[PDB]
Design a binder for this molecule. Structure first.
Ligand SMILES: Nc1ncnc2[nH]cnc12
Ligand SMILES: Nc1ncnc2[nH]cnc12
Ligand SMILES: Nc1ncnc2[nH]cnc12
Ligand SMILES: Nc1ncnc2[nH]cnc12
Ligand SMILES: [Ca+2]
Ligand SMILES: [Ca+2]
Ligand SMILES: [Ca+2]
Ligand SMILES: [Ca+2]
Ligand SMILES: [Mn+2]
Ligand SMILES: [Mn+2]
Ligand SMILES: [Mn+2]
Ligand SMILES: [Mn+2]
Lengths: 251, 233, 233, 253
């Protein structure tokens, strides 16, 4: 089995690939532009990935990896919320895509297998063309139109503790968010045939955009991030030990 | 920091403390009685804990542990569902408590700090005296009347993958359940001041009971279990 | 796969099985008796094991566990060194054995499979009947006469950081010691067919004895201990 | 605390930075050139590092990382030839380009201490160079010079697996290296104090470097069959060694 994992409580540019307005300051990862006075900027786009590629599966052996990631984000608006942040698995060379409601990871709301991108979004602005009525968490598979969503009551300026996992045995992708301050929690799950939607190797990280209008803005700060992946030697899949993963990585 | 952790995909009596009708068979942990033909039995009560005590906090240093546990259960009814299964943190010497709707871990629905027990229940039968309308997941703190619950649609005979965690920094206890077969998931969270509700050392494990009537029965099988704890200095 | 692991930087009696003069004080594990003034005592014997049994192998599946342990000991003599400390894998019910040069884990220097005990010793006193000329580290398999040893220059009163591992793939048991203060290190390795020398379940821990004479004494303090085991399917 | 770790039982180019003749084939990492017929080549040099930099310490907080690595190598020399030159596990500056070949193992330029080299390595030297080497084949700790600050004799078992384990404990500042040839049940260990914050930069790349002899008959192969690495950087000055019991079973065993 092959394993790769990391856990950061403090950020520094060397281990990350930064794109767009993504910057590291005061130990935290700021995905979108922010004026010196502290207020967000419109039309911003930022991405950040771990500098080492992760192998999601192996065509020759037929093995599929199980993985998990957890991070803490803080979204603040002075002003209306827009556009959101996504955790994404993109092709290794990958360059940013459309901004605004496309969150920098997609080009359209029509399924396009060739986009080879899967993401879990925390959408703060409903786009009439493809979005559910309110702020939501969604699973995007090669299109900005989530294959599943759940309502989310964003607590402005308060920490959000997210946990995403993929179990190769059940092919189930599960995402959950918790706002400790309000004792509120959300969860969502859907089956995803990963070997068909992504390449063998991918970069893992975040993508975030602000609104395209003067008053549709918010900040996207990642305060901590952990990731762990396990690729077996044969077809037989083996979920990860989360009890052990969080305490040794998150708690 | 002190750490203790384990992960079982196969069960064997040696590493566990079995109470009541709790038994290990064919590699799985069966908390409640089951007739040879495979059908559950009424008035059953079973408990099982890891043989090594876990230190939840330290009075002298003021440190509080963060921990997590995950397991897979399978609940089946031929009949009506009753009574449920709970993941519990009990005092080390601890003997079973009332059966039926008390799930073997409590004696009343009135808060009693001296019970020194905290549990996360998967309640399959609504007891008029203290339960919400339907089947639910709840956090119990020294009383069978959950301080918080969430509706749960139990998928009969299908695996349930549960994950419970306690974060000492936020004092937040979070429980989640997933039925992979139906792609359904539930989550619940509530702040718990653990150092006030439990002793420094506890045993961790499960407790399960069946209904007290002829037709209120179900099975409680644990197929795998992991636990991890970290106590700072 | 089944996994069990723990790591202590601070000790407390609840999670351990203490035998003989083994005691926990000021957060450390003291295996042998010590007078209030701080000086060791002769004819002492102490043992301590983790309260949860560990499965070394499985007869039905034919799987053998790989494991590792690491700890820090401090041995001090006011006086001549005796008798030593051992890391041992004993049968679960196991009661102490002969003291003195037998380190509390064996009864003779003649191989006796029925002893079902394997130990890695840090022998501070050469017993003419079975010991190499000086202080040594040795691997004992069902007898106090090590099947392999290595010379060891004990640094009185200075910490010793030990690491022992068992690789089921190669059947190799490897032990190593490091005295950071003197920048000295020792290593030893030998093949051991574990499934033949021990039972499926064992208790893991330490055993230590002092000399049987008035001036053959030393202290045996364990300052930290970690253990990890993995049993495949 | 910041943590980074990985463990490979099978190799693939994407996650590694390959330099020189370093190549990945049949799942293993081949550091030095090898003719199709299987025999090694002279004057070869190969290096390979994990694609993500590792932070060894932090100047602002004064924290120093504790880390460990373990790997399995197989060194082989054809009957008619002689062993040369060796393989090293190294911690080099991030941009770092290969250095002198032959007995310099691709990581150093001289046997005179040069702090500006900012490189620390643990070598498995198969050829004694009169100018700075002990009499026989050895394991040594090199700190900014090819002349080890400490060595230990090593009886290389030709063609047999070598299981190496290297660790650095920030609390004691002790670097410890060990090798085991399971086939022969032989083992070696070496240890020495190293003030890492003074010999290396805050960020480094971790990996291997290997060279073959500069003569027609001084050649050997350098194959890495598996590799694990784990690092932990605290938030303050206070150092905390790693849990090796847990590290090997979860990574090596
Ligand atoms: N990703 C996830 N988030 C929350 N609970 C889970 N249970 C299993 N996977 C989970
Ligand atoms: N116990 C838990 N279950 C699901 N998601 C979580 N996120 C944090 N703790 C969690
Ligand atoms: N037990 C052990 N001690 C020291 N080095 C080792 N390398 C492999 N096993 C070892
Ligand atoms: N690097 C190392 N190799 C072998 N034994 C060790 N004990 C502590 N560190 C070690
Ligand atoms: Ca949107
Ligand atoms: Ca009930
Ligand atoms: Ca002796
Ligand atoms: Ca040389
Ligand atoms: Mn959306
Ligand atoms: Mn209830
Ligand atoms: Mn001896
Ligand atoms: Mn040399």
């Amino acid at each position: 089995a092959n394993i790769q994992s990391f856990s950061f409580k403090n950020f520094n540019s060397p281990s990350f690939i930064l794109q767009g307005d993504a910057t590291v300051s005061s130990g935290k990862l700021q995905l979108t532009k922010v004026k010196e006075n502290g207020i967000p900027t419109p039309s911003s786009l930022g991405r950040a990935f771990y500098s080492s590629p992760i192998q999601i599966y192996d065509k020759s052996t037929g093995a599929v990896a199980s993985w998990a990631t957890s991070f803490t984000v803080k979204i603040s608006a002075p002003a209306s919320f827009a556009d959101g942040i996504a955790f994404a698995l993109v092709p290794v060379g990958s360059e940013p895509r459309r901004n605004g409601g496309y969150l920098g990871v997609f080009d359209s709301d029509v399924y396009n297998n060739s986009a080879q991108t899967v993401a879990v979004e925390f959408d703060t602005l409903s786009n009439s063309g493809w979005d559910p009525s309110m702020k939501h968490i969604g699973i995007d598979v090669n299109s900005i139109k989530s294959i599943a969503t759940v309502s989310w009551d964003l607590a402005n300026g308060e920490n959000a503790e997210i946990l995403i996992t993929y179990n190769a045995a059940t092919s189930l992708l599960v995402a959950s968010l918790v706002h400790p301050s309000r004792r509120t929690s959300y969860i969502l799950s859907e089956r995803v045939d990963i070997t068909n939607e992504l390449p063998e190797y991918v970069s893992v990280g975040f993508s975030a955009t602000t609104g395209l209008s003067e008053g549709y803005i918010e900040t996207h700060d990642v305060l901590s991030w952990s990731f762990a992946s396990k690729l077996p030697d044969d077809s037989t899949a083996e979920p990860l030990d989360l009890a052990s993963y969080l305490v040794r990585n998150v708690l």
